[model samples]
Target chain A: PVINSELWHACAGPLVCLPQVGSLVYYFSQGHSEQVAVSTRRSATTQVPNYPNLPSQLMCQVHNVTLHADKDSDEIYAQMSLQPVHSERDVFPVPDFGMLRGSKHPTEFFCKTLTASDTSTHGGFSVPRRAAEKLFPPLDYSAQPPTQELVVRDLHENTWTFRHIYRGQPKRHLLTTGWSLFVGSKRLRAGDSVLFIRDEKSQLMVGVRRANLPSSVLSADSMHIGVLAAAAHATANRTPFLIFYNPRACPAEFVIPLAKYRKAICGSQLSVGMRFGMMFETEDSGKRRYMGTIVGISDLDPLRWPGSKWRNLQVEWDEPGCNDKPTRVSPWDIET
Target chain B: PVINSELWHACAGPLVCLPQVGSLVYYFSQGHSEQVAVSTRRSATTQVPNYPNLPSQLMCQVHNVTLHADKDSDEIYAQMSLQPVHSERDVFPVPDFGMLRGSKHPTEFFCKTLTASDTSTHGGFSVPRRAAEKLFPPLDYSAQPPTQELVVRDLHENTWTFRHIYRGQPKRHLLTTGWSLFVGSKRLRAGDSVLFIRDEKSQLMVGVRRANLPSSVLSADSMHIGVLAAAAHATANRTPFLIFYNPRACPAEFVIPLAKYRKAICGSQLSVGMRFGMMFETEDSGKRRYMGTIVGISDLDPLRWPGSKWRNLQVEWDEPGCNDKPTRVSPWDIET
Candidate 1:
């Protein structure tokens, strides 16, 4: 079953992604879930154009993916729909997942575009000499092979140890012996880029991103709209909210499509003097909904004091008061 | 006021003691609390010997500790009465605070006894060369003076950074400059020991233990017997439980004094053919107290298969014709 809480937001880049191999992701629009990862990237017969607003070019090859859920029927789609690339200035207000507090940001230490020999019978992957020096502990030169042990943890937190050796005549850094096992087990190809990260605990984690994914995996309309509706309903009903997280801090990720959000708020439209309810979370995380009325709506120019071109609504709460005036709130902060 | 849950068991030895300097401990017995570390260790004009069964000596020094609570009258006692020391073989049933399920154990990387010079105006603490090498990243000698920054976290999880320099003619591992500041801040003495631990997340945490604490600081009776009664009532009334924890695992540390637990269960005694109520924790951590009657009291020898030395009360609920046989329960499991 597709758990609404486990949804993941997929942005444009192949390198910056979420819910990697062997992980679950809920595609909110379809009401179905899939454990997605990079399958092989195959080139399309016709060239595809990048989204008009996105600065980066679209991947030429189509991503061949499979879903573990509902495999008995339809065989799943070959390509999944991708959310349209969002402008940096666009605001996609989502209920905070509360995972960021006290969490130490992960550091990416090494990223390498693979070479043919890295995945071949050569049985080794070369690391940049500079990166190797900083990443691995100094090797003992007096040892027979002048080698050190490098333990690399994968996204799944599985640890793999490979012999990092300087055996070439000129002394290059090579992940030897166990490198082939990693490549074979992950079914990685020469074009895939492997990235290594050091988490807050100083543990090394490795992940892969296959290059050249297909353009127009599916129509943008099919790409996760239910999440927006769910978010709207949750706000209206004062229910719990959940969001898919992108491991790296990507501000542009999790952007709710304007059309989807617009459709979600269609039936419960807000107007001046309409009685609305807003949910406020207490310090203990308990939530309470307060009734209020939309007093007015004004277009707040982005450039003035705060500098944002967004609509702010003036709300007058039902509480008895003598002097205080109505407060201005963002549309994201209110519910009808 | 003293909280019942924050109390720790004081069986024997200062190392095994709770409420270490700067640690919080709840004195449930009294209606107040203290953040008492240590005042001074003094011998009584009359020597106080060890308890009849315990191998450790009793505290001869009058605690003379002050509290932040209700300080209006009778200055805190001299030698607070100690709880009767229990035998290792005896079992004292308690309302398990249920704090632990499966927690990863913390690691102790370094612990050292302080020397006179270490806390003096020397302004530097010598760290074992081997320990320094293992605890820190390799130093880049090319950098001027060959110094590296070392970050250590304290019990409160506050991070402290010290400059580790290799400078003297023999190049020893020295905690320079910051050492004096730390010593002054923590008020370290020559006899005290500084301990360094690497948590599961690889964060380095440091703590201290002063040597020769009076074998007993405050007696266990005055320590926190009310916590036992509170735990019993909380179990009976199905309330929440709280506790002050020593980061490391010490199952023997929280053992309730048999005498105290005995007294706690005294009035709410369970017997054969008596009505009883048993509270069960629900999935959401809520509780439901079930009414039942003890049908039989059996001396199920734990050695035979699985059992208890205390008479196991067989219970039958108010409901009729239940297929399951009456299950035997310990008196500690029910309330009047």
Candidate 2:
């Protein structure tokens, strides 16, 4: 489990250092519910029902952390194999990485949501002007048409050569050559995202993220069922189960860093009719917070489903403006 | 020998992908002469005489390539340890890495020569305006004094954190906090340089380079003597010896990429009274070429030092301007 820590951390990204392998962490499934909500439209698709008697948090020990890169998207992620230490809503000292308060600069990164033309076979990726300027190597403005061959490696260690060209026709940036191949090879579609980062040693990295989960099975209520069943099975057998966590996709990490959770909830508690505000990522990659009141506190379904922290607090937004806001949120979703 | 090829390559930069460990490469002593000239004040300090029968090139097999970081400057560089394969002016098809024409972008990098204030402990590193905008992460202009922490790892894998602050006083960029620590720790002085690069995995790397070679011994004519004697000793015993090659410092890699060498001299040769032009890096890191005629051909010393490719051609500049140009150049120094 003491694998290449640097590579693992890079995949985990700057904001999330991830708990050290074999370290104890508080696993919060209800927090995972909100992550699923962000990953997909929970109402339109599978309605994940909160189950019964599920403790708010469980103390678990991460046995191993594995590096996984998607075959299609070539996105690298961390998968944690862990074993429950014991007891429901277990209490114990746990390692905390300060995941939420990660301000330390780890890498230089820029990401852009893909457009139709970007993923088009005929048209190349129309790199955002600012993105091109900030992320890519400086192009020679002296040339008639500034162009350079950009060689980047993905999480899979596969090298990709992209032709970066700045044209005068309208003065735009583009990833022309070798981009079509990347699009075709990765099977990336519009609305999906492309990420570029330059590491400390000045290496350029290119990665991809799918706009949506791969299939119904992946982001399904079935997944929720599987998560519970796996935990139950492991708890019964005192064995171990693994979880593939792509924090970018599912921002809510089930295995919460103990210190981070403590920091979040320190001197703060949320109950019915409580006024609260929390941040959410905007379409343009900017984040802003919204004000809301904790309208009610109860299990989603006391009959079929039991007690779980996920989406447990029904909330009403101040906006009263749009249905875009979630009607319910987990305690871990917002900071008080 | 086959350690982490990636780290080694990162240190070597893009153009010079060193020969695989145990692979044969043609080593040229003369090529190293040009490198020496670039590293120090050759004419003002030492008048190096080219040694005789040293062979235009020798066949060498790389024993190892070590990653070294300067204790003072913390600059990460690749040091190649090679053993002569055999022969005087050996004729063999050695492996070639195109070291000269490095078009492939390996990393996103920006570096600047330090000034008086830059190295002054009283002041901070006044980052070049454009350099900060390109190399550093995008600062939040939304704030009055936009700032962020910049963390970078060097060849030693030591992390140095510098606070990047954009000031409105002069609308300039500066590295304020933690930079002095770097300066003090690395012992960097004025005329020294700092380099920042972002690697493929988007890791930030910080490194240092002394403007001039360290100590009288490092750049001493003694080094040249050691180089030749090392080769001679290895040749005499036919025993394997190691070399530490820092291409950035040396620039003229003595072990020429056979293919690169072949391409440089391809269908082009220089003789007395022959006209040619070649590029030299400018003070500001830009490069330009000048016209010159090979007026004579002889070793730096025909009496003491014999035939060698290094600094053998006595050239007169067509510029008829400044006397900053070299009076002698090696065959590998120019491409016709």
Candidate 3:
């Protein structure tokens, strides 16, 4: 009966922590216990409720952090700001991860931003994006790195071309590593996305995005980006072949944290869009942790924001736990 | 937590018969009191298993066909033979299907002609490959009436490829649905092999085989698939994507069964694959079901019959109740 016994008992995979990211690193965490930084750079380890074994264990720990709770309401929100010592340092706007070096320009930022209480007064302060990047400069792959974020605002607008900042073909070679998009939204867990390379006539094309699920739980399971690419070799005429890429191992150039994802791939080509879905733990009394992803995706004219927008790009959920819960596990939005 | 009470009550989806599929057509006779079946294709119906609902009902059904079942042991073996019966007049080969097909092939005619019991004593009733082909032509979708048969095979193997011998691309495409590879195998249920398609870049891709549980059973509630495409499209320029595909959904020709999946779009230009996942129901004990997807797929070849095979693709189970004793509900080998 306990089918996921090993899964539940196994020590959670590696814990990933993003340092003083001026912009919020909205991501999901899978282990029964993990740490979150309270301050701009503060970190704290926390444990998941009802987790088996490890009683009274300190799951997460961070300094210079504080929890913001509503005095009367059961709602809670976390606010991180800059410390005095942060001044006098070169500050850069969080790398607008909204747009990848090879994607369409990002209209708005999806990650959280660390605002200076006195931007005009305290002239010295950088945001998370720049700070994080400076702290952990993008790793080098055998592949090319773009000079600027790729702006592919409208994949269909130009049916024949891709807005890749890094032009034309990539040389074929052993894939020692690559990148991943960390997503934090209303439905996604910290590390829910994956990326793969696209297959070509011998040459491989790299790609990334979230996988799709059935219509039933599409609402709860849809959110994070699921990526994939092609295999290095072609299988026999009719046989199957596969290629793998890991986020924990790969470095991410862009990160999208939202309730739904909207994208598609013909082969090496990517499309723009939006999606819908809900989020939650797999069990009320068990240990089934899952991140989120778009249950479905739809297309629209990039030039116009239509009224039936939600219709084309959303997944409708009729599940009780998903619908009844007023406050969800994900911090999709914070009213300013 | 009965999620969608309305959908559960309506139960508009497919209604499967428990145990084995009999030659009878079954239904919830009006008042929801009994599960009756019509013995003969023309005979009046009778209450075969009538009573109060058997606590929890487990049922599975697919129509019109035969599978690889060991005659001596009466045990089913998916790897033995899978003869696609495209027409109704397809004569039932005597004794074993594998032996019959093997003997019919030009490659095996010499052995067959020599094995004749007594060539002179009785004019052989052998239907060799040529005769069989005429009698049971490949599924002709363009013909006046399209010949169809449902075939259920256990899900195993990492990379499986079989020549699809059909006329036009099947519009009522092959619903390569599933239950579970490991779970089904362990639970002793019939799970068909996984499959895939190519993306725009001429690369083979697979799908995620996930768990699909009936709303009634809450314990085994997790498992998913197709989340990759949704996430990629959802995040688009916001984040890179990631996902897990089934071992077989990576081929260029494979199409998503339930969607308006256009195969033409998946030309020689398509790459990547969709992983396989499954949602299955049993018809014996526990009124239970399960759903999950193909979590991991490797390029490892299978050691079965012909070498260079991809076998036993692993799976992640999100629910339970799949291991309980199930009254086999196979359509082909069922008795009324």
Candidate 4:
């Protein structure tokens, strides 16, 4: 259930990495197949990924991890063996579970949303002072202008070095030298996000998070078929059967940290007049939580996607200038 | 119609470029939506791209080309306006089309399949004597060993300069320098094919063709829904409707050059005892047409995909040791 681990991650793709071994998790079946953001369900040719009941939520433990590549496309996919903690089938209130989502390892992580300026071939990756303080190798703060070489390896195990220089009129931290080469090499584009996680030993790892992309022509009704089949197969076949999760080509994450899903249901069980907050992006692409009140509850598409948990809750935001945000919301889309 | 043009072509993706304007074409509705190779059709969940007869084979003229992208995915899709040559509604014997699948411009193209060595990040792309004499610029044969900097642009408009050196104990052509960077940058793996087209001005353009990928999980049954809906909207509207085709994720090309489809029909109309040939890859991946006798002909799947144009003809390959080839194939998959 830990999104960030001390282990290796791969280059960003439509497939994401599997959970860590022994990680505590809440397999939330509700948000499992809600790829509505990029589907053409209104075509009336909808065969929703409706598994009778994968169980609204199941407490589980990651038993094992197996790396795999598809025979045909040669793309990377993985097998995650999850063992249900059957004794306690319901969500439990654990002190640490209520704390912010944390990792099995003492890892500090920072995420940066990319901007148009940072995406250009000749551009520099501007780092926040807060980011440099925590993640960047201790800067030469005593120097006229702090500058040093910052090195990290990506999930792909590819190494990168950048000239972390604190310069310019505002004296901000900016990566200049090797930064452009990395951008052009990785094909990093505007709107995508980048995350760096440093372990207790000070070893650093890099990973990428894709930005919201326009959905291609759908009818692929596929992502679910594949997801459910994996779940079905996993449940039937020694429970170690594999499931492919492509961050670029998938629905909401089916499995969540035990604490994350617990808090979602705690306050937003979620009734009318319930209060909640969801995260939205900003300039540097750093995210901010926007609070809102649930005015009502309803299905996303009453006739077609009936009983769908996708964006099923209606809300009135407390934040103004929110023209792009959705009026309807899903249980998992918010924090209660 | 003209897969090769005097103009430009882009890097390969799940989406291909739109058809050329003012090109002669046969909109063979027959093979429009058969992605059987990578389908999970047996899941008992089915909704094929069944738009009642898009037209068996209607001659049409490419009126216009408008490239567009999905607002969400930012992936490419295009609109092609087709004006049916209603006068010659029936198949016509266009002698030139019957000659060879030629292009609107004076361009010559050569395709070379990749090999394990050729696809290596540090490996070179082997160029055949035939390939070199035709595509590469004149070599300095007068020198101890002939070589030149072979420069070209990919469909992405990215430039490449490979050391087209003719050397080795065998003294043949091999792309040494810059080839590896190109291969790694493009992420070309073994079994994928690369094609190069040289125009009259000797300006070269490159493109990549993906190899077959194993079918992923099924039940989403949506490729067809999206395809047919496009067709439905296309025919109902001004006819300049668009489609998103990723050569990597589609049925056979629905639109064929007037001559190409005619040849597939004439020799392979394809009755029992019909003799036809299919091209297969060799050691160097240069293709050699393998002839086969049509011992029988029938639908691929009587129950599910009955009357499917995919792999309908049962064949007895003339070449032995053909254990890997299918016993059946589609009409367009062969030549008379």
Candidate 5:
């Protein structure tokens, strides 16, 4: 039965777009629809996939999908059977990725340069004292050992459990045990930057940016001072912005100056049919170049990139209709 | 396993009152619980029961309950399984009670006197042209048969389907087919008042009140018109106030004058251990008198009656541990 006949008709049409697994989709039932994250099955095992760095014993709640065919039409509709994963264990982390992007805004801390000791067999990563104090719950100062459990989300939205300690060997704030596993799986090296964020609901998250971009394009003269602060300010203001980073030194990234962005836009005589090359990320954690032609240009800000102007190019790649095939790029986003 | 440790602790305790089958419940599993309506089994037929007056063919969704014993403790916990009621006809009144009190507040119209023609086999109940226009969707001016479907909820929150016609004989807006059933079931009479309300979301509701209160108590001289408006005004302003109404008449009841309420409170030397008689509705839908003694008096408005003052008296009935035992009542609520 159609939950909301009107919206179901409006949303489901001949040109149906299947949302990628893990993306949020609207489930219309009982005259209303709510957004819920989709969980897909692993093709190899036909089982719901678990997040990396987590024990296989911990099962995550996921919506199971069942498809039904229409007798009168070629299109197929889906029915979802949803249930929360139940466990008797008290220490398992629920792989609910919804918490990260669901409803809360997380406070982000930018890339911090890794230290030599962080990669050592000391079984812990040193956390900046101020960052630990602000992002973590208050600890008992009178206790012999100040320790707490911290759950952090990685860039892939996978949770990493950690034992945080304020009083330990050498008496420095550090994330222990789980830190090594996360560092190992993320393949972090010294000098690579790690990012930490705390959500409004007090969930901690960690991400990393490696300095593995092509160094041939980056020169020392291109570096800008205070770029990090400028980029942070732009993000806070929700302004249209771009980050300029050296492939050889990602932590040395800078915010593209407003003057530079405007100069690139105003000085360009770019038009439709113009050929350009855009950088694309690939599987196995590598970057590749994609060549495409500007199929059209639109003045409308459909993507709603904050403070962005009316100029955007729609490029159709040489590869047939793939993801980002007809990608939209700003003047500074592409190379002619 | 407890889904959320905090909420599970808060909601789970001894003396648990299980909600009715088909009710929406929070199924806490894993670390999160989502609200889902339950499906239950009827005692004998092993089928879900349809609400009264609604077609039995249309199976309304019901919530099922199961009790499990705790191996470690004497406590018993509950688990709820949920699903929608399905039918072969492809149409059913979802049995969702969440709609009436769920989100919309309907505008109420009370005590419009009925006409003789309304009770006739002419198959239509007369509605005031003004109310018909405002409460209903507009009809096309050029239509030969000016008719539209109108859905109205009763006081019991059951929806009634009516075909509203404007182009019939006498040319007045009338509710056809469903109106007679409602009139018969409610046992409405000529002088009986029917209340009509349209919620903010444009859903219609109808209720009835009989003018069958004891005439000896309501003398010709004990009338007040502005009292109703005053009580409404006081409620609107959030000021402390009271309403005196005979529970017998219910919807057909009149508001008592402020002077009467004040006199009842200030003039009486009410105290604990006082004897009184209160009216109680019986199983056969008849009123019965119950004898009770005033066991206590507290200043706190425990019932949280809107706009109430320190005028409530807690009474203990002769029958031990009865429904509403030691119930609180206002000074005017009892007969000394």
Candidate 6:
């Protein structure tokens, strides 16, 4: 399973390079403030590309900093602070997972073109991919009993399992509060749309439509069910852990392929399609769950999230003629 | 205020030293093991020293890695995996506090040192030390209340505040425990001696002597009191934070002279010094908090912590005489 290299890199934090194997580079910097270690002696100095970007939090005030040697220059670049003031930069020469906790798994990886080294030399590599084995049944689109196990591990060790059921997907018309944003009202009816948004004052404001049914819809029940299961675990553990769905009305965007929804279902009649939406929870903050309607659904699926085996499943709406039309009927576009 | 530079180089977690600043050097062994990278091609490779020794729990696997350079030698080091797998290493880099939201008094000193270039020229050079006078307060041992604030933040944004009732110096001591390391009972009494264990039996355990007061002796609670306090306003928004008072069991081995409990605390009443201990939540199925014993402390009246001011306070007790011994008999020693 080849994970998207970019996403994999994005997930990994700052890349710390170094010069000289076994070279002991003590990368140290003041917390928040970029600091330079100056040799009292004159002319023993080197400048770097830019100051280092510190992380949000550092246990120690000054952490050992590092810079990789520029093989091209034989000179290593050290990210110094600008005037030694406030700017956050991640310190380098950072410790590995083993260095932090033994029980925790260590994170290690190698990057280079397959040709850079011996092609026969298939060294160990780390890449993101789909689970080789499925914990649940396949997405057979057939009407079968729920088989997906929803393993939920609360702040406590309690694990809850639930079978996931797939409902038919539906195209939702939503009101745009601007910026490809959608504000959905539970009262959304067929053909109606509205976008939820915050006003300039950052107030929780909503824009509603006058005609048809409200277009805003969400994959609501599933998330609420997940949170309730998590809550039960938290309560049993005597720890203050909670799962909130939509604890905050912040705007998050996602797209659903209307055609794919139609294909996944056995029978496609009229504008038949799957619904586009999302479910997320802020775990550290007592597990608050939130689900929002997809800003838009596309003709394609999110490429199995970068590093998964699932192929990009294109949407195949049965009725190609009606599929192209905007499912949402906005007030402005109404014919006079 | 000048924070202590000692911990800056300490291996607090799994860390790696890359040889190149930007080149991503992947380190992996043949078969399924090892992965590493070189980034922040910024130099300071000179600062790259030998990899610190690994804790027993943490094991490192070496592999044939590729270096991106006109020439390749061991001189180029990259971030090595401190753990077992490469995929697990995809942890996100932490941003520095200065770059986060709500840093109102964001000073230039807050920038993180990204490269050696940055570290070489501490960013805030133009401003003289006197211009940015740091507010450091002395610790008052006699006073029960600390003048300033102490805060600890968890994974969440919430902050926990604590008063400076006592600030302990780093100290070292030996620790003992029962079987099944994950959930074993610490075999040291309160106020027992301790040390910083760099590596141990499949775990990075901090050692300390059990301070079980002999029967008829003063109770453990009487000698020290644990109070919960909130952090300063700047970090008020941080969640899962805590204000901890680590009066450790002993001072750092090298810093303080070895003396019996009687001689160390009674002679000048200084051996019984205050030190900070870490708060640990056990990884075993049942979660627990194990406060790491103080690894360093001094016999001085004014205690100073890195990045802050001097604190003149002590949280300790003395035997008051050289002949003092355990007042009560223990089953392990007395019966035999």
Candidate 5 TM-score versus the reference: 0.21
Q: lDDT per residue, candidate 4, A19-90, as tens digits?
A: 556566766434445433233232222444343434445557666554443322223334455655555442
For model 1, how does the per-residue alpha-carbon lDDT over A182-295 read when each residue is reduced to its tens digit? 888777888766765565566665656554421111111111222233232332333323333222222222223343334434444667887777665322123467778878
Model 4: CA > 4 A from native: A1-107, A111-133, A136-150, A162-195, A207-289, A307-309, A322-324, A332-336, B1-291, B295-312, B317-327, B330-336
Q: Assign candidate 6 its CAPRI class.
A: incorrect
Candidate 6, residue B236: lDDT: 24
What is the docking quality class of candidate 2? incorrect
Q: Which stretches of candidate 5 lie over 4 Å from their true place?
A: A1-257, A280-289, A299-311, A319-326, B1-336
Candidate 6, residues A216-326, lDDT tens digits: the string is 010112122212222222223222221111101111101112232225332432232433322222211112222222233332213212321111222332333545523
Query: Sorted on lDDT, highest at the top, how do the candidates line up?
Result: 2, 4, 1, 5, 3, 6
Model 2: how far residue A229 lies from native, Å: 4.2
Q: Runs in model 3 with CA error above 4 Å?
A: A1-332, B1-54, B58-133, B136-336
State the displacement of the C-alpha of residue B71, model 3, in Å, after optimal TM-score superposition: 32
Give me the TM-scores for chain A across all models, comma-separated: 0.44, 0.73, 0.19, 0.62, 0.35, 0.18
After best superposition, candidate 2 residue B301: deviation in angstroms?
89
When candidate 2 is compared with the true two-chain complex, its DockQ is 0.00
TM-score against native, each model: 0.26, 0.41, 0.17, 0.50, 0.21, 0.16
Question: Judged by DockQ cut-offs, is candidate 4 incorrect, acceptable, medium or high?
Answer: incorrect
Per-model interface RMSD values are 29.3, 30.3, 17.7, 8.3, 38.6, 26.5
Candidate 3 CA-lDDT value: 0.21
Best by TM-score: 4
* Interface quality of candidate 3 as DockQ: 0.05
- Candidate 5 CA-lDDT value: 0.42
Worst 10 residues of 2 chain A by lDDT: A213-222
As for DockQ, the candidate ahead, 2 or 3, is 3
